[PDB]
C-alpha cells in the first residue's frame, strides 16, 4: 500500500520531534537492515538524522556505517549551503557530538574517513581547538594521517592561530616532500601560452590538465590558510608567493572557482601590495611568454588580457576601498576599453559573476541607490542570490514601494533569482504597499504574487529522495534516469498573512483560500484566527457586509480586542478594494 | 563620602558600600534612605540609624554581597525578623523570583524505583531489575558503566545483561544462576545505584523494599525497591567505549580479532607531532 518513497516523503514533511514515533512504528526496516537506515539518513535532513540516531541508540546497536552516512549527509548539506547561499551551515558542536557518540559506541573501530569528515565539518566554523583535540585523540590511538593534518591545518586557518596551521603545513611538507610543490605546479603546466587558454575553451577533447580532486582539496586548504595569514609573511614565504603567482596565472580551471579563490585569497593584502604583486606577475608572465587611483587600474588591465576578462576585473573590484570606486571602475574602465580598442572584453562585463561582485560591493556598503542604477540598466542574469536577498532587505529599510516591486518584476523574476525567507517577506510587503498605492490612485496580479512565493523560494536543504524505479540497482536494468522528487515549498505565517492581504486587496479571495490550504498541506501551519478568516473570505466572495461585521463582533466577544483588530484591518482593506 | 556608609543598628556599627544598599534602588529599602544626599551633608561618612536586631542586620547585608540568603533553622525569632524586615523594606520580593516554565537543573529530592521480576526453581534465581529515576539530568551512561566494570570481574556476561532503555530508566537481567550468585549481582547493582547518586551531590534519606506473592500459575514475583535522596551538596583520561545495547558471545567468534579495529595504511602514516613516552 505504501512505498519507500512515500515513507521518505512522510519523514521529510514531519518535524524533528516526530522522528521518534515513526522510527518506532516502521522499525522492521531498521532493526536488521543497516543499508536501509543509511539510505534513510542520506535522504533526510541532518537534524532528522541525529534525531533518528538518538532514537536508535536506546533500541538497536548502531554501527560505524550509520555515523559515516550521517557525517556524509552533513558534508553534503555543507556543499549545498556553499552552492545555494541560503540556510545555515552545519554546526561544529553537532558534528563533535556525533563523533563522540561514534567513538563512545565504537572504540578504535571508526576509519580515518570519520575524522576527515569531522574536520571538514569543523572547517567552516573555524574551530581549531576541536581540531587539536581530534589530532591528539588520533595520535593517542596510533592512527595519525597526512590528509588529517591537511584538514586540521584547514581547520586552524584563523587570524588567531594561523601559526599553528603553518606549522602543521610545515610538518606535512617535512613528512611528505613532493605533494605540495606538485599540487602548486599543477596550476602552471609546462608549455602554456595564450593559445592554450584559447583552445581550452574553443577546441574539442576536454582532457584533464593535471589537477586531481585531491590536489583541488589541497589547494582549497592552501587558499583558506592564505586567506587567514597576514600579508607580511605571505609575501616572504616561498609557498605563499608561489601560490599567489600561480593562482593569478592558472588558466587550467573554470573562471568561477578561480574568481572565488581570488576573492578569498588577496583580501588581507593592502591595495599597494596587491597592485605591486599584480604588476610583478604581469611583468614576468608577459616577459617569459612574449582621484589618481582610478588611472592606476587602467594601466593594470591593458597589459593583461589573454582571456583574463572574468577574474581580474572582479578581483580589482573587490580590492577597491569603497563602492563608488567600484562604480568608477565600472564606468571609466569601460570608457577606456572604448578608447583602447577593447571591444572584445566588454562582452564579459555581462557575465553574472561581475555584476554579482558589484552587487556584493554595494551590499556590504549598504547602498541601495547605487545598486538600483545597475539593476535598471543591465540585463537580468543569474545572481548568486546571497546578495540579492539582503539588497531587498536594504531597500525595505527605505520604506519605499515602487523600486522594490519594479526590480522584483524586471530583474529578479526573468533571471530566476531565488531569495531567502526574510527577503520574500520584505518583497511581499513592498508589493502590498505598491498595490495599495495603485488602488488609492484609481501592477501585481494575485496569481503572480502566489507564484512568486512558491516558484521563487530558496531553502537551505537539498532534495535527495529518489523515486522507486529511479535508483541504481543491483538487479535488472533501469527504465528511467535517476530523478529527484522536489520538496513542496514551506511558507512562514508572515508570508501567509501577506498573501492573504494581497489576495484581498487584489479582489479575488479564492487565492487566499488556496494559499491557506497549501500552507495546511505542506507544513500544518494553521493561523490562530483562521476559522474567522475563512468565513470573512467567503463573505467577501458573496458580498455579505453585515455578516462580515457580525463575525467581527462575535470574534471581539469571544477572543480579545487585539485579535479582532486584525479582522477589522482585513475588513477595511477589503472595503477599499471592493470600492 | 560616596564610598563608606555607617549604619548603627542595635549598637553595632557596620561599614558598607554605597553599591550594596543601592543594588536594588527601586525598593523602599534604598529610596527611603538618601545615600547620595547624606554623603553631601556628612563629608566623612554617611550616618544612618536603624532599629533591628544586629544579628538579623548581618543577614540582610550579607545577602547583598554573597547573593545567597540562608535562614536559621532553629532560632525562629531571628527567622521571623528576616521575613518581616525584608517585606517592610521591599527586599523580599527581589530575593526569591517566581519563575514561569538550554540548561538542566537537578531537583531537590530524587526517588529511584526499582522493579524486580523474580523466578525461583529449586535453589536458583532469575532477576530482572528495572531501574527508574525520577527526573531528567541523571547521566545513566555513567551509572551503567559503574555496574558493568564491577560485575565483569565477578561473573561472566553470559549470565547477565545491562543496557539503557530511556533517559531516566535503565535495565538489568540475570539468566538463571544460583542464590549465592544472584544475590551477589543484586547487591552489587544497588550499591552502584546509590554510589552513582552520592556522586551527583545527594544523600540517601529513606528507602524501603516490597516483596509480592506469586502469580496464580507461575513462580514469578515482583520485588519493589524504592529509594529517596535529597539535595545535600549545595551547587587526558582513558576512554572506555562500549555500545548501549550489548551483543551476546555464544560459542566461537564469527569474526577474527584483527577484523574488529580499523587501521590506516603505512604510506598514509605520519610522525607524531606530540611527544609520546
Amino acid at each position: 500500500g505504501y512505498t519507500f518513497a512515500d515513507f521518505l516523503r512522510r519523514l521529510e514533511r514531519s518535524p524533528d520531534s516526530h522522528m521518534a514515533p515513526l522510527y518506532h512504528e516502521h522499525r522492521e526496516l531498521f532493526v536488521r537492515r543497516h543499508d536501509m537506515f543509511a539510505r534513510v539518513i542520506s535522504s533526510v535532513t541532518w537534524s532528522k538524522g541525529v534525531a533518528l540516531v538518538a532514537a536508535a541508540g536506546y533500541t538497536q546497536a548502531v554501527n560505524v556505517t550509520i555515523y559515516r552516512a550521517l557525517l556524509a549527509r552533513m558534508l553534503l548539506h555543507n556543499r549545498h549551503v556553499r552552492q545555494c547561499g541560503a540556510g545555515s551551515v552545519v554546526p561544529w558542536s553537532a558534528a563533535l557530538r556525533t563523533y563522540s557518540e561514534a567513538i563512545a559506541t565504537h572504540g578504535n573501530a571508526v576509519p580515518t574517513r570519520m575524522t576527515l569528515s569531522a574536520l571538514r565539518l569543523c572547517t567552516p566554523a573555524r574551530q581549531w581547538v576541536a581540531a587539536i583535540s581530534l589530532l591528539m585523540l588520533s595520535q593517542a590511538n596510533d592512527k595519525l594521517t597526512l590528509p588529517m593534518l591537511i584538514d586540521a591545518a584547514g581547520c586552524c586557518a584563523t587570524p588567531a592561530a594561523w601559526e599553528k596551521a603553518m606549522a602543521l603545513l610545515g610538518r606535512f611538507h617535512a613528512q611528505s616532500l613532493q605533494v605540495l610543490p606538485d599540487s602548486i605546479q599543477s596550476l602552471r603546466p609546462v608549455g602554456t601560452s595564450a593559445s592554450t587558454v584559447d583552445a581550452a575553451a574553443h577546441a574539442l577533447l576536454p582532457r584533464s590538465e593535471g589537477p586531481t580532486p585531491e590536489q583541488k582539496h589541497i589547494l582549497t586548504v592552501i587558499n583558506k590558510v592564505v586567506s587567514a595569514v597576514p600579508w607580511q609573511v605571505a609575501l616572504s614565504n616561498e609557498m605563499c608567493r608561489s601560490y599567489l603567482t600561480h593562482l593569478v596565472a592558472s588558466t587550467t580551471l573554470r573562471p568561477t572557482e578561480k574568481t572565488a579563490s581570488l576573492t578569498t585569497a588577496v583580501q588581507q593584502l593592502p591595495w599597494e601590495a596587491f597592485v605591486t604583486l599584480m604588476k610583478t606577475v604581469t611583468a614576468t608572465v608577459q616577459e617569459g611568454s612574449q582621484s589618481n587611483s582610478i588611472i592606476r587600474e587602467g594601466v593594470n588591465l591593458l597589459q593583461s588580457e589573454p582571456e583574463t576578462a572574468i577574474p581580474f576585473i572582479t578581483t580589482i573590484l573587490y580590492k577597491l576601498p569603497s563602492a563608488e570606486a567600484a562604480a568608477l571602475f565600472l564606468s571609466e574602465a569601460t570608457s577606456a576599453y572604448r578608447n583602447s580598442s577593447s571591444a572584445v572584453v566588454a562582452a564579459a562585463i555581462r557575465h553574472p559573476v561581475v555584476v554579482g561582485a558589484l552587487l556584493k560591493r554595494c551590499a556590504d556598503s549598504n547602498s541601495w541607490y547605487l545598486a538600483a542604477s545597475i539593476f535598471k540598466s543591465t540585463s537580468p542574469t543569474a545572481i548568486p542570490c546571497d546578495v540579492a536577498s539582503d539588497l531587498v532587505i536594504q531597500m525595505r529599510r527605505a520604506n519605499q514601494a515602487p523600486l522594490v516591486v519594479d526590480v522584483l518584476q524586471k530583474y529578479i523574476v526573468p533571471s530566476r533569482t531565488k531569495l531567502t525567507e526574510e527577503a520574500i517577506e520584505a518583497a511581499l510587503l513592498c508589493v502590498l504597499v505598491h498595490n495599495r498605492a495603485l488602488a488609492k490612485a484609481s501592477g501585481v496580479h494575485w496569481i503572480s504574487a502566489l507564484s512568486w512565493a512558491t516558484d521563487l523560494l530558496e531553502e537551505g536543504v537539498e532534495s535527495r529522495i529518489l523515486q522507486t524505479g529511479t535508483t541504481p540497482s543491483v538487479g535488472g536494468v533501469n527504465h528511467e534516469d535517476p530523478t529527484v522528487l522536489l520538496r513542496k515549498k514551506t511558507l512562514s505565517p508572515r508570508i501567509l498573512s501577506l498573501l492573504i492581504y494581497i489576495c484581498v486587496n487584489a479582489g479575488s479571495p479564492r487565492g487566499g483560500l488556496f494559499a491557506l490550504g497549501y500552507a495546511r498541506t505542506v507544513s500544518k501551519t494553521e493561523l490562530e484566527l483562521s476559522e474567522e478568516i475563512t468565513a470573512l473570505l467567503y463573505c467577501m466572495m458573496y458580498d455579505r457586509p453585515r455578516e462580515a461585521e457580525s463575525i467581527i463582533q462575535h470574534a471581539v466577544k469571544k477572543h480579545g480586542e487585539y485579535k479582532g483588530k486584525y479582522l477589522g484591518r482585513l475588513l477595511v482593506a477589503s472595503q477599499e478594494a471592493k470600492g | 563620602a560616596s564610598d563608606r556608609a555607617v549604619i548603627n543598628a542595635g549598637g553595632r556599627r557596620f561599614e558598607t558600600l554605597f553599591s550594596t544598599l543601592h543594588r536594588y534602588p527601586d525598593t523602599p529599602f534604598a529610596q527611603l534612605f538618601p545615600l547620595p544626599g547624606r554623603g553631601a551633608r556628612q563629608h566623612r561618612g554617611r550616618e544612618f540609624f536603624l532599629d533591628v536586631t544586629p544579628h538579623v542586620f548581618e543577614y540582610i547585608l550579607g545577602f547583598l554581597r554573597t547573593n545567597q540568603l540562608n535562614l536559621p533553622a532553629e532560632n525562629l525569632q531571628i527567622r521571623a525578623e528576616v521575613v518581616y524586615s525584608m517585606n517592610q523594606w521591599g527586599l523580599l520580593e527581589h530575593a526569591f523570583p517566581p519563575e514561569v516554565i538550554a540548561v538542566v537543573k537537578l531537583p531537590d529530592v530524587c526517588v529511584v524505583q526499582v522493579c524486580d521480576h523474580m523466578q525461583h526453581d529449586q535453589g536458583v534465581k532469575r532477576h530482572a531489575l528495572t531501574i527508574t529515576y525520577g527526573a531528567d539530568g541523571f547521566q545513566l551512561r555513567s551509572l551503567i558503566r559503574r555496574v558493568r566494570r564491577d560485575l565483569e570481574r565477578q561473573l561472566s556476561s553470559t549470565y547477565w545483561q545491562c543496557y539503557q532503555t530511556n533517559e531516566r530508566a535503565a535495565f538489568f537481567v540475570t539468566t538463571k544462576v544460583a542464590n549465592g550468585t544472584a544475590d551477589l549481582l543484586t547487591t552489587s547493582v544497588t550499591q552502584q545505584l546509590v554510589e552513582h547518586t552520592e556522586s551527583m551531590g545527594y544523600s540517601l534519606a529513606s528507602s524501603y523494599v516490597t516483596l509480592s506473592p506469586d502469580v496464580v500459575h507461575t513462580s514469578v514475583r515482583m520485588l519493589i525497591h524504592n529509594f529517596t535522596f535529597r539535595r545535600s551538596r549545595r551547587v587526558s583520561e582513558t576512554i572506555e567505549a562500549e555500545p548501549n545495547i550489548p551483543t551476546m558471545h555464544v560459542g566461537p567468534r564469527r569474526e577474527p580479532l584483527n577484523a574488529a579495529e580499523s587501521i590506516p595504511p603505512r604510506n598514509e602514516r605520519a610522525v607524531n607531532i606530540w611527544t609520546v613516552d
Binding site: I103, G107, N108, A140 | R148, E152, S156, T238
Partner: peptide, 16 residues
C-alpha cells in the same frame, strides 16, 4: 590525548 581501549570480559581476564 586520550587512549581508547576495549574493556576486557571475564572470559578474557580469566583465560586459561
Amino acid at each position: 590525548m586520550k587512549r581508547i581501549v576495549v574493556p576486557h570480559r571475564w572470559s578474557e581476564m580469566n583465560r586459561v
